Paper text:
Data collection on this smaller, ALK2-ActRIIB:BMP6 complex yielded a high-resolution structure containing a complete complex with two ActRIIB-ECD and two ALK2-ECD bound. The cryoEM structure of ALK2-ActRIIB:BMP6 was resolved to 3.2Å, and the map was well defined for residues: ALK2 (31 to 109), ActRIIB (26 to 118), and the mature BMP6 ligand (410 to 513; 82.3% of mature domain). Notably, the β2β3 loop of ALK2 contacts a charged pocket on BMP6 forming several charged/polar interactions between several ALK2 (Ser41, Asn60, and Asp60) and BMP6 (Asn450, Ser446, Glu444, and Lys475) residues. Further comparison of ALK2 and ALK3 reveals that the alpha helix that is formed in the ALK2 β4β5 loop is uniquely extended an additional half turn when compared to that of ALK3, as well as other BMP type I receptors, ALK6 or ALK1. However, the additional helical turn in the β4β5 loop of ALK2 positions the C alpha carbon of Tyr74 3.8 Å closer to the ligand fingertip than the corresponding Tyr103 residue in ALK3. The cryoEM structure of ALK2-ActRIIB:BMP6 displays a strong signal for the first three carbohydrate moieties of the prehelical Asn454-linked glycosylation (2× N-acetylglucosamine and 1× β-D-mannose). No molecular contacts are seen between carbohydrate chain of BMP6 and ALK2, suggesting that there is no direct contribution of the carbohydrate chain to ALK2 binding. We do observe, however, several interactions between the carbohydrate chain and specific residues in the same monomer chain of BMP6. Specifically, the primary carbohydrate moiety forms a stabilizing hydrophobic interaction with His452, as well as forming a hydrogen bond with Lys482. In contrast, ALK2, with a glycine in this position, is unable to form the salt bridge with BMP6 and is thus reliant on the presence of the glycosylation to stabilize the prehelical loop’s conformation for binding.
Author numbering:
A (entry chain F), B (entry chain A): 26 to 118
C (entry chain E), D (entry chain B): 410 to 513
E (entry chain D), F (entry chain C): 31 to 109
The structure:
Amino acid sequence: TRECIYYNANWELERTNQSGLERCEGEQDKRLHCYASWRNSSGTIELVKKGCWLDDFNCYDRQECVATEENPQVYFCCCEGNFCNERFTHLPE
Amino acid sequence: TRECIYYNANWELERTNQSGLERCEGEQDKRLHCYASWRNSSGTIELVKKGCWLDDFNCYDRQECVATEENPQVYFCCCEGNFCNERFTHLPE
Amino acid sequence: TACRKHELYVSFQDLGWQDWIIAPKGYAANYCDGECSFPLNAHMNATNHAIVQTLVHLMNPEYVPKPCCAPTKLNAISVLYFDDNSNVILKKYRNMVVRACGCH
Amino acid sequence: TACRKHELYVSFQDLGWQDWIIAPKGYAANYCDGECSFPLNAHMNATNHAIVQTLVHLMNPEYVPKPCCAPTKLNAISVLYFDDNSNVILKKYRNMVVRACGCH
Amino acid sequence: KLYMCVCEGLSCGNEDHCEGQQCFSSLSINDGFHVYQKGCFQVYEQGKMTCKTPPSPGQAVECCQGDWCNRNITAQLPT
Amino acid sequence: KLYMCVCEGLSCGNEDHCEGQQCFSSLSINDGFHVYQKGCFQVYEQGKMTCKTPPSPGQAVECCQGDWCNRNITAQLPT
Ligand SMILES: *[C@@H]1O[C@H](CO)[C@@H](O[C@@H]2O[C@H](CO)[C@@H](O[C@@H]3O[C@H](CO)[C@@H](O)[C@H](O)[C@@H]3O)[C@H](O)[C@H]2NC(C)=O)[C@H](O)[C@H]1NC(C)=O
Ligand SMILES: *[C@@H]1O[C@H](CO)[C@@H](O[C@@H]2O[C@H](CO)[C@@H](O[C@@H]3O[C@H](CO)[C@@H](O)[C@H](O)[C@@H]3O)[C@H](O)[C@H]2NC(C)=O)[C@H](O)[C@H]1NC(C)=O
Ligand SMILES: *[C@@H]1O[C@H](CO)[C@@H](O[C@@H]2O[C@H](CO)[C@@H](O[C@@H]3O[C@H](CO)[C@@H](O)[C@H](O)[C@@H]3O)[C@H](O)[C@H]2NC(C)=O)[C@H](O)[C@H]1NC(C)=O
Ligand SMILES: *[C@@H]1O[C@H](CO)[C@@H](O[C@@H]2O[C@H](CO)[C@@H](O[C@@H]3O[C@H](CO)[C@@H](O)[C@H](O)[C@@H]3O)[C@H](O)[C@H]2NC(C)=O)[C@H](O)[C@H]1NC(C)=O
Ligand SMILES: *[C@@H]1O[C@H](CO)[C@@H](O)[C@H](O)[C@H]1NC(C)=O
Ligand SMILES: *[C@@H]1O[C@H](CO)[C@@H](O)[C@H](O)[C@H]1NC(C)=O
């Protein structure tokens, strides 16, 4: 089992939870991960979506959460670990 | 819903019911029928298997139970009706 | 040239199951045939993977073959057959007939 | 010439889903290919209808085509995509990857 | 919701009336021909993914959301 | 029960060991060749139906119930 911090920016319109930590779910023999997605905004960091992510090949054994994509409209980093979506950096690959 | 008389000749070995009337079961939009199978034995009629039968094209609108097969090792007649497996005749087609 | 449910009647006299099956002498299998091309309408009951596959086939024809027209909804039929000990047994064989063919 | 699970990596840059999908940039579809011939071993996960069909094909080749190598076990993948109102939404698309291919 | 649109094309169950969440019109280049298709999508996930692809050579999936929205929105290939 | 038999042939998961309810050996005429197959059946209904067919031109499904019963029971076509 695993668990990631679930913050959703659209809490109002979808009448969903804004803050909290949510347990992850998945099928047998299926790794679960944490995902974070935010907007840098030339320094003014604005968190967008954070939560659980299903099995992904490119998101494997990521003890930290690093957004390797260079100059993206929405930065996105996937990590494998318990509550690994609380720290994130943009390190271009 | 439908119901047919269930008599099974193998009641001993399979530890199943010998006599009785059993409700039929089937899926939605699936006709159910009654089936009887016996051995004539040159006059000494011996009932074998009687019970519920699933959807069958050749067993359609058979208000009676007639075994049309000529000279079979085991006579078999399928009927469509409530408790239609209590009377059976061997009328060759 | 479209995923359809072609109807046919298969007889057990032709398959050689003649001296160990008492009834039915034959039933209707209703095989499936056709081809699946991008995009697929709601009539062709297809999965998301089928759609991704037909799209990657449209982008590159030799990369991936088209999806396959496969049965999706099946029913069961009762078979009264002889065993190896001259006894007769009734069994509900599952997934014997086809009632819907999609691009599975 | 056998129902197998060929592995491949499909990228969303090639399918044109580049400016409305944030992650993943690509995944593994693992398409299925091969042929099914009578009889079928337990490895080829096949239904009873598939067996009846391959048998009626062996008896007569032009009557019925061979069964189709189709996926049987599928999983789901999470997609974080833009909608039509510049918002971003996470959705679990079901039946996107293949983990077993049988003669369905 | 549900929307009734025409279902002309090589593949349909002999009913032009097609009730779907997203109707569309497509024009491909499959098997070197100009096959035309018009239909409906009763699956939101599939309708979206197939209506968000960018028109290009080989595909022309122009969709529509309204009532009988498919009749006069014939697809056309790009440049 | 379960019985371990060889799984030689064009289709197997790279494991000769095949645990099944009914092992067999087949020799067909598919695509005009003499392809040989040897395997196991972990499905009683399918094993029975495929082992009750009468050997003829095109098929030679000789089955077996015992331990390693498949090794030396090679199939042979009829007259
Ligand atoms: C949001 O974007 C800003 C601007 O691109 C990011 O700041 C940048 O962080 C990188 C980290 O590698 C800095 O590069 C390094 O900086 C110093 C010298 O300035 C030195 O350690 C290295 O030689 C290397 O060049 C980069 O300078 C810096 N840019 C600016 C304008 O400050 C920031 O990390 C992004 N934050 C998030 C949360 O995405
Ligand atoms: C078990 O088998 C016996 C013997 O085959 C069946 O009796 C046969 O019943 C048929 C019914 O059509 C009789 O044919 C008719 O008989 C009389 C003249 O005998 C007349 O009505 C018709 O002209 C016609 O020929 C047939 O004669 C009779 N055979 C004998 C030897 O009596 C019997 O019906 C079978 N019973 C079951 C339950 O399967
Ligand atoms: C995709 O799956 C759907 C749903 O199972 C299939 O729709 C089904 O199509 C059949 C054949 O047209 C319909 O049967 C027909 O229904 C009426 C009423 O009896 C009549 O026209 C015919 O006598 C026949 O029985 C069936 O009702 C219909 N099911 C539903 C729920 O709409 C569809 O065929 C599948 N796609 C393909 C390509 O096979
Ligand atoms: C018919 O269905 C069965 C059951 O789903 C499939 O068997 C599965 O085959 C795959 C591929 O060989 C196996 O995965 C492999 O397992 C081991 C352990 O990790 C290793 O050799 C490989 O790393 C790979 O992951 C899988 O375990 C196996 N499942 C079971 C339950 O035995 C079979 O492939 C299907 N038939 C066809 C023709 O695809
Ligand atoms: C979601 O909100 C409900 C209702 O207030 C609350 O009971 C629950 O603990 C919340 N969950 C998380 C993960 O924050
Ligand atoms: C089957 O036998 C059980 C146990 O005696 C009995 O309760 C039940 O009514 C029987 N059913 C029929 C159809 O005879």
